[PDB]
Curated annotation (Swiss-Prot), chain A:
Organism: Escherichia coli O17:K52:H18 (strain UMN026 / ExPEC)
Keyword annotations from UniProtKB, A to Z: Acetylation, Ribonucleoprotein, Ribosomal protein, RNA-binding, rRNA-binding
One Gene Ontology cellular component annotation held by this UniProt entry: cytosolic small ribosomal subunit
Source superkingdom: Bacteria
Residue numbers of the full-length protein present here: 1 to 100 of 131
Record bears the keyword RNA-binding: yes
Family: Belongs to the bacterial ribosomal protein bS6 family.
Chain positions found as N6-acetyllysine: K93
One GO MF term attached to the UniProt entry: structural constituent of ribosome
One Gene Ontology biological process: translation
Encoding gene, per UniProt annotation: rpsF
Protein name: Small ribosomal subunit protein bS6
From Swiss-Prot, chain C:
InterPro entries, sorted: Ribosomal_uS11, Ribosomal_uS11_bac-type, Ribosomal_uS11_CS, Ribosomal_uS11_sf
Gene of this entry: rpsK
Alphabetical GO biological process terms: translation
Function in brief: Located on the platform of the 30S subunit, it bridges several disparate RNA helices of the 16S rRNA. Forms part of the Shine-Dalgarno cleft in the 70S ribosome.
A GO-annotated cellular component: ribosome
Record's protein name: Small ribosomal subunit protein uS11
Swiss-Prot record, chain D:
GO biological process, one term: translation
Functional summary from the UniProt entry: Binds as a heterodimer with protein bS6 to the central domain of the 16S rRNA, where it helps stabilize the platform of the 30S subunit.
Entry's transmembrane regions: none
Key words of the record: Ribonucleoprotein, Ribosomal protein, RNA-binding, rRNA-binding
PROSITE patterns: RIBOSOMAL_S18
Gene label: rpsR
Protein name per the record: Small ribosomal subunit protein bS18
Coiled coil location: none
Database matches in Pfam families: Ribosomal_S18
Curated annotation (Swiss-Prot), chain G:
Listed Basic and acidic residues bias regions: 57-65
UniProt xrefs under PROSITE patterns: RIBOSOMAL_S21
InterPro entries: Ribosomal_bS21, Ribosomal_bS21_CS, Ribosomal_bS21_sf
Matches recorded under Pfam families: Ribosomal_S21
One term under GO cellular component: ribonucleoprotein complex
MF terms in GO: structural constituent of ribosome
Chain intervals with Basic residues compositional bias: 43-56
Disordered: annotated span: 40-65
Keywords associated with the record: Ribonucleoprotein, Ribosomal protein
Lineage: Bacteria, Pseudomonadati, Pseudomonadota, Gammaproteobacteria, Enterobacterales
UniProt xrefs under Gene3D superfamilies: Ribosomal protein S8 (1.20.5.1150)
Stated name of the protein: Small ribosomal subunit protein bS21
Organism: Escherichia coli O9:H4 (strain HS)
Sequence similarity: Belongs to the bacterial ribosomal protein bS21 family.
Length: 100, 88, 116, 65, 49, 51, 65
RNA sequence: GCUUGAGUCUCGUAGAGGGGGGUAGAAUUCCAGGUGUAGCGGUGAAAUGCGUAGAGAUCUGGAGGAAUACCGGUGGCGAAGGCGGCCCCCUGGACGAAGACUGACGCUCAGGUGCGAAAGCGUGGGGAGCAAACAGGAUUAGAUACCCUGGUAGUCCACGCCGUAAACGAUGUCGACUUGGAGGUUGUGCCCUUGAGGCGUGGCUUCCGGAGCUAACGCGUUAAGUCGACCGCCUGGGGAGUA
RNA sequence: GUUCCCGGGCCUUGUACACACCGUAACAAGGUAACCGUAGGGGAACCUGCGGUUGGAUCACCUCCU
């Protein structure tokens, strides 16, 4: 219903087992009335400051039109999933697709 | 705030038009229904020292709204409270 | 001793005391020098010439380790911060990089109560 | 004066951060209004984007940690 | 009209009147300090060219 | 008419820059307003078909 | 903050430290907060800086000397 | 009954606005370990204290607590007080393009009620930094004062009471009226927004001034100018904003 | 040569002064800026912490970039 730009990062060591993680979350969006606009994938880019041991996390983007109550519980999933350490949801009304 | 898909319902009922939300029988309803949607705010958290003035504002504008409807036509007045239920 | 070339020289000129200390890249301290131990106790503790002698005290008794390219990382915006740097360049060193990693809080704790 | 807020109408994004790098420095500092002639609208929009990128380690906070 | 870079694409007529004005003030100076005739007349030939 | 066929980069000059854009040269970069676009152009009155 | 200039220098040149902050962070975290005080001297300062602009506007019309 | 008053709806906007909670990072204090010196702190100067039971200082790791540098801008929100990191949940106030309506439903107001910085106290947690009472060294004729080493209430969070102020651009509140420029800040309409613009329409706020007022300073479209409406206040100060 | 020093003069800045410079608390920046509110203490003025305001002073020099 509303637009939520869920941008998140997993660790470079989880960059090899993250595609399974992607199918996890996107399947849930389809089971929660939703449609993806851009599965933006850059790669494992260098972090400015290493997080307690290593830098270079892996960035993956959603930018999905989805209901606020399911994404809320979805954010709880991210919060207690230790691969995805930094994950935030953005503004509504417009989720983009370009600039990659 | 009063969500839009509750608002449009209320306006088309009380009013003849869908834009007829300026008639007192509708002005008061959307004000009361706005507080009915605001109950979820003053029921929890309790310390809204800013939203406090907002309540006093819209409800006072309603006390005098019902004031003139009272003095002009007691038939539609008792009808406003008989179609929504904003007396008590 | 310990054999180090890159000596992280933290020079902390606060307000009325300037401390110069070269440490190891890892962290093993090498030798220190202060505006208060070389003498100059007073408004002289707040002078860059005292900081120049502080650099000189941190120039000798440290050749036992033998640093050349040193990371003079300056802390605390104080009196010296250049007289001390050129004291080291005229001491026989080659400062590979002068960094400004001063003790910076994001206005974390409150500042201290002093001066009037 | 600048050609980023002229040919760049409507909210400057931050996926590719190269444009915010025109408005920050190589230290991690944010450029002030008086240098590049850029009215606050564009200026504070960049502001929102920047805070977000630093939380996600795209942009650094200070120089060194 | 200087040349875009650091040179002169100008009508070097200016670079010519330049010397004319140089030598002009020169002989008037040789009136003030009163220099010998053979050289002020040498300047006559100079402003002449 | 006067279309562009191929583009030609060409040095411009410090003479061509104002003090207002000598501040933006210390920020943005050197090769931004240093070289201009003086490409190969089709003079007025010439038609053609690139083959 | 971090200046290097390879190896031909024989000079410090901490000119970026000053172009960063230097005394910037210090002005607020050296002596007690006082909260409202700096605000006061901000008004006085502006009154004399804007008057400097009024000064630049007063000299343009005559200054016949 | 009719509208130039108030107000509502459809479509959008920015933010230190408030309540509850979670989280990231630096620095200060302390503890343990690697290293090492003979000094650290501070002041106009000095000194108590710490220290050879290896302090101050640096690096790695860790447990608490308070507060958010740069961005910062007589910038922003708000009735006011007051309030700067980010986000989630609930949600308020202000404003604008183009239309539809009830048809003055508007304003203020003693007794009253609510909000009410900071601080004090009762209670459950708590303590890095600073700091009433107090101990010590001195400038001094003296120090219960400037300064410094320690340190309790407190500072912080939640529930109440006291319900106090320079709660002061000292400018009470709503509406109407009155040549402009530089700005700052937030939207929209129109035109080649081709490009960092031009011409209008509202809110908040700053400086220079005209009409006007005043003792003067100066305020000046946000007025100390011109009116209507409502409440409170003064009749020399001290005594006393007290018993 | 006017920065050092003794005297004179012009302009400017500030004053609750003009009767005209037991402890100095305010008025010069009173050499610790002032004032109101809250709590506590001290022979006494007031002091310390916190919030706010202008019924406040100088924005004069010494070193670095075209």
């Amino acid at each position: 219903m509303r637009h939520y730009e869920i941008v998140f990062m997993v660790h470079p060591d989880q960059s090899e087992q993250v595609p399974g993680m992607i199918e996890r979350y996107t399947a849930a969006i389809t089971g929660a009335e939703g449609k993806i606009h851009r599965l933006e994938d850059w790669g494992r880019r260098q972090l400015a400051y290493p997080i307690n041991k290593l830098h270079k996390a892996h960035y993956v983007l959603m930018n999905v039109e989805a209901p606020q109550e399911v994404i809320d519980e979805l954010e709880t999933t991210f919060r207690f999933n230790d691969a995805v350490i930094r994950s935030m949801v953005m503004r509504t009304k417009h989720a983009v697709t370009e600039a990659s | 705030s009063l969500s839009t898909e509750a608002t449009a319902k209320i306006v088309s009922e009380f009013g003849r038009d869908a834009n007829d939300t300026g008639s007192t029988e509708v002005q008061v309803a959307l004000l009361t229904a706005q507080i009915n949607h605001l109950q979820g705010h003053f029921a929890e958290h309790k310390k809204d020292h800013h939203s406090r003035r907002g309540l006093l504002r819209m409800v006072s504008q309603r006390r005098k709204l019902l004031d003139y409807l009272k003095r002009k036509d007691v038939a539609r007045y008792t009808q406003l409270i008989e179609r929504l239920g904003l007396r008590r | 001793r310990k054999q180090v070339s890159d000596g992280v020289a933290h020079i902390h000129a606060s307000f009325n005391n300037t401390i110069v200390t070269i440490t190891d890249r890892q962290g093993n301290a090498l030798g220190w020098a202060t505006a208060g131990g070389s003498g100059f106790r007073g408004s002289r503790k707040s002078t860059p010439f005292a900081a120049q002698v502080a650099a000189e005290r941190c120039a000798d008794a440290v050749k036992e380790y033998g640093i050349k390219n040193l990371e003079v990382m300056v802390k605390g915006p104080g009196p010296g911060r250049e007289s001390t740097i050129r004291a080291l360049n005229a001491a026989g060193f080659r400062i590979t990089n002068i960094t400004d990693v001063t003790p910076i809080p994001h206005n974390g704790c409150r500042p201290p109560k002093k001066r009037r | 004066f600048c050609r980023f807020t002229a040919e760049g109408v409507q909210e400057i994004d931050y996926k590719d951060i190269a444009t915010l790098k025109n408005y920050i420095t190589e230290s991690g500092k944010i450029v002030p209004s008086r240098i590049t002639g850029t009215r606050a609208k564009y200026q504070r929009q960049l502001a929102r984007a920047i805070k977000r990128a630093r939380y996600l380690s795209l942009l650094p906070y200070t120089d060194r940690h | 009209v200087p040349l875009d870079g650091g040179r002169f694409a100008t009508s070097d007529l200016n670079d010519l009147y330049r010397r004319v004005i140089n030598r002009n003030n020169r002989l008037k100076r040789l009136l003030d300090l009163a220099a010998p005739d053979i050289i002020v007349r040498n300047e006559k030939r100079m402003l002449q060219e | 008419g006067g279309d562009i066929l191929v583009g030609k980069v060409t040095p411009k000059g410090e003479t061509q820059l104002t003090p207002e854009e000598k501040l933006l040269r210390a920020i943005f970069g050197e090769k931004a307003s240093d070289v201009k676009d003086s490409s190969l152009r089709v003079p007025n009155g010439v038609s053609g078909t690139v083959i | 903050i971090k200046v290097r200039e390879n190896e031909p220098f024989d000079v410090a040149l901490r000119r970026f430290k000053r172009s960063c902050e230097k005394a910037g962070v210090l002005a607020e975290v050296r002596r007690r907060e006082f909260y409202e005080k700096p605000t006061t001297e901000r008004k006085r300062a502006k009154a004399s800086a804007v008057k400097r602009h009024a000064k630049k506007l007063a000299r343009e019309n005559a200054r016949r000397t």
